């Protein structure tokens, strides 16, 4: 069937859309080539619509059926809880899209009578009605990139009342089932340090390793009705409350498999028969579907001793090499099997014999040295998109601060330490906002974090070595330097000067600011301060940070205030 059908009504914006980076002194201090930075808008939605619309042909075989039964046997060990309306309300982000039914995210969080009554009515409707398609809104996503343009991605999501119901029926399932089924292959259970440990150990565990990333083109569009019912068959193996079983059955047929698309103006836009990006099951469903297809395709291809690592549609496989020619042929056999399963490739996969050459989750393993000179592996990435987005977030107030999430996840990197920490600490200190909580996203869930808490967060995530790395790889330094020239970012010497300046000011303030000066900016001085374990690090409640993925799932993981 066709992934989408369209009526001809346009994908519309709900307000004026900004496509150009503003010319602003604070953003200009970070990046001078402002014309290279853009944001996608509804103006390119028709180009995306063409790319995402196609017929799917899917053929399943014994390897697919065998792997599915293995997955269901593991899912059969799970007992999932139904969340109360109150618990599900608390998981709603404060800025989540308002309902069309007279209330918004703040009313949900406050347990307002109108919000709670409506959510209850939506829940009862899921229990009683197993067929009526649930409405969804289709919007063009606003995302920032550097030139060389990408058309906007399309986001599809149901009303706020339905989103709260999805949490009640499935939040516990999507949080616990993926690890029970996929074990060590489930990417979202790892912090960045644990992910690099798993990749390095897996690589080294092979006699003669070969690895590859597999890029599925327009993955959400390749997900078929059959895939979404297979995914439901795995969820149905859980022990579930009867109302949760019915809600999952009703959501599967009424929402997850497909449904009508409405634009921001209320016009009938078309019909979806593939994965919606903005529902609670997208991350878990994509991961399960990708894992299932790839595990079966590994068997079809006769790849030896595979270890996969999956996060949504992002897949990396590390295996035992059978020789150069044999590996090349086996990878072609894998791609053919994936294509039969409706997971055709974007970039054709290539065998890699060096762990550092593999990009998975847009990141690569690199090496630096700690204060003792010992090798430390860590994950890095090309900093172009992080810097372009940091420039946009400096010029405009954005709902999510990607710069803050990038400092958290990429804290050991040369670019996050020299550029991102320096830039934002300089601005926030001048604005007396170092202690002001900001929203960021980790594995798709929203968190409210004070920048002054970064040292203990980084210590917990990455270890104290994240504050002592030096002697970065020539390849990594070259990639950063080239990026700075391309974007017009001041050279590293300028960043060191700015860092020494903000470090002095932070130390002068005492308290949490002085801890930031000591740990975050020790790289900027010769006269190193002593770095000891931070008392706050061991008390941090990081429960729920690296458990599961929630991209598009409308999840907020920070604490709810008592009433
Ligand atoms: C990686 N790749 C993905 C592809 C498709 C769907 C999901 C998915 C998830 C990842 C995991 N991952 C994320 C992320 O956004 O979930 C991040 C990340 C970066 C910056 C801010 N917040 C984040 O969560 C990752 C960082 C690193 C170093 C990873 F190895 C994996 C990450």
Swiss-Prot record:
Q: Which residues make up the binding site for Mg(2+) 2? A: 215, 313-314
UniProt-reported outcome of changing residue 361 to R? In strain: Isolate pCV-J4L2S
Write down the membrane topology. Answer: Single-pass type IV membrane protein
Q: Which cofactor does the UniProt annotation name?
A: Mg(2+)
What regulation of activity is recorded for this protein?
Activity is up-regulated by PRK2/PKN2-mediated phosphorylation.
Give me the reactions it catalyses.
Answer: RNA(n) + a ribonucleoside 5'-triphosphate = RNA(n+1) + diphosphate
**Co-factor: note:** Binds 2 magnesium ion that constitute a dinuclear catalytic metal center.
RdRp catalytic domain segment(s)? 209-327
List modified residues, type Phosphoserine: 29, 42
Q: Cite the post-translational modification comment.
A: The N-terminus is phosphorylated by host PRK2/PKN2.
Where located?
A: Host cytoplasm; Host endoplasmic reticulum membrane
Function summary: RNA-dependent RNA polymerase that performs primer-template recognition and RNA synthesis during viral replication. Initiates RNA transcription/replication at a flavin adenine dinucleotide (FAD), resulting in a 5'- FAD cap on viral RNAs. In this way, recognition of viral 5' RNA by host pattern recognition receptors can be bypassed, thereby evading activation of antiviral pathways.
Oligomeric state and interaction partners are given as: Homooligomer. Interacts with non-structural protein 5A. Interacts with host VAPB. Interacts with host PRK2/PKN2. Interacts with host HNRNPA1 and SEPT6; these interactions facilitate viral replication. Part of the replication complex composed of NS2, NS3, NS4A, NS4B, NS5A and the RNA-directed RNA polymerase.
Instruction: Report the protein name in the record.
Output: RNA-directed RNA polymerase
Whole-protein residues included: 2420 to 2987 of 3010
């Amino acid at each position: 069937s066709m992934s989408y059908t369209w009526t001809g009504a346009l994908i519309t914006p709900c307000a004026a859309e900004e496509s150009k980076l503003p010319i602003n002194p604070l953003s200009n201090s970070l990046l001078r080539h402002h014309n290279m930075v853009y944001a996608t808008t509804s103006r390119s939605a028709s180009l995306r619509q063409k790319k995402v619309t196609f017929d799917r042909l899917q053929v399943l075989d014994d390897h697919y059926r065998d792997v599915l039964k293995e997955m269901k046997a593991k899912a059969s060990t799970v007992k999932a809880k139904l969340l109360s309306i109150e618990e599900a309300c608390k998981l709603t982000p404060p800025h989540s899209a308002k309902s069309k039914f007279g209330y918004g995210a703040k009313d949900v969080r406050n347990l307002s009578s109108r919000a709670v009554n409506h959510i209850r009515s939506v829940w009862e409707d899921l229990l009683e009605d197993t067929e009526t398609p649930i409405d969804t809104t289709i919007m063009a996503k606003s995302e920032v990139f550097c030139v060389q343009r990408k058309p906007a991605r399309l986001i599809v999501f149901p009303d706020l009342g339905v989103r709260v119901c999805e949490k009640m029926a499935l939040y516990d399932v999507v949080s616990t089932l993926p690890q029970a089924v996929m074990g060590s292959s489930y990417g979202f259970q790892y912090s960045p340090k644990q992910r690099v440990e798993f990749l390095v150990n897996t690589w080294k565990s092979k006699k003669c390793p070969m690895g590859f990333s597999y890029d599925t083109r327009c993955f959400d569009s390749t997900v078929t009705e059959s895939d979404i019912r297979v995914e439901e068959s795995i969820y149905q193996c859980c022990d579930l409350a009867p109302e949760a079983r019915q809600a999952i059955r009703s959501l599967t047929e009424r929402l997850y498999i497909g449904g009508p698309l409405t634009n921001s103006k209320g016009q009938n836009c078309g019909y979806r028969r593939c994965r919606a990006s903005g529902v609670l099951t997208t991350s878990c469903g994509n991961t399960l579907t990708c894992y299932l297809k790839a595990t079966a395709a590994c068997r079809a291809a006769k790849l030896q001793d595979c270890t996969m690592l999956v996060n949504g549609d992002d897949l990396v496989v590390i295996c035992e090499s059978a020789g150069t020619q044999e590996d090349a042929a086996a990878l072609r056999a894998f791609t053919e099997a994936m294509t039969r399963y409706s997971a055709p490739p974007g970039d054709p996969p290539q065998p890699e014999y060096d762990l550092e050459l593999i990009t998975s989750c847009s990141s690569n393993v690199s090496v630096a040295h700690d204060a003792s000179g010992k090798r430390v592996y860590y994950l890095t990435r090309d900093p172009t998109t992080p810097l372009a987005r940091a420039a946009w977030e400096t010029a405009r107030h954005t709902p999510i601060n990607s710069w803050l999430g990038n400092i958290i996840m990429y804290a050991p990197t040369l670019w996050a330490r020299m550029i991102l920490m320096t830039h934002f600490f300089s601005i926030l200190l001048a604005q007396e906002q170092l202690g002001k909580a900001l929203d960021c996203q980790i594995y798709g869930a929203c968190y409210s974090i004070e920048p002054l808490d970064l040292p203990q967060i980084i210590e917990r995530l990455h270890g104290l070595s994240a504050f002592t790395l030096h002697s970065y790889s020539p390849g990594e330094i070259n990639r950063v330097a080239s990026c700075l020239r391309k974007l017009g970012v001041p050279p590293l010497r300028t960043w060191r000067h700015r860092a020494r300046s903000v470090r002095a000011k932070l130390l002068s303030q005492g308290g949490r600011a002085a801890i930031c000066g000591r740990y975050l900016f020790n790289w900027a001085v010769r006269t190193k301060l002593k770095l000891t374990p931070i008392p706050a690090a061991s008390q941090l409640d990081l429960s729920g940070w690296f458990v599961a993925g929630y991209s598009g799932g409308d999840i907020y993981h920070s604490l709810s205030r008592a009433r």
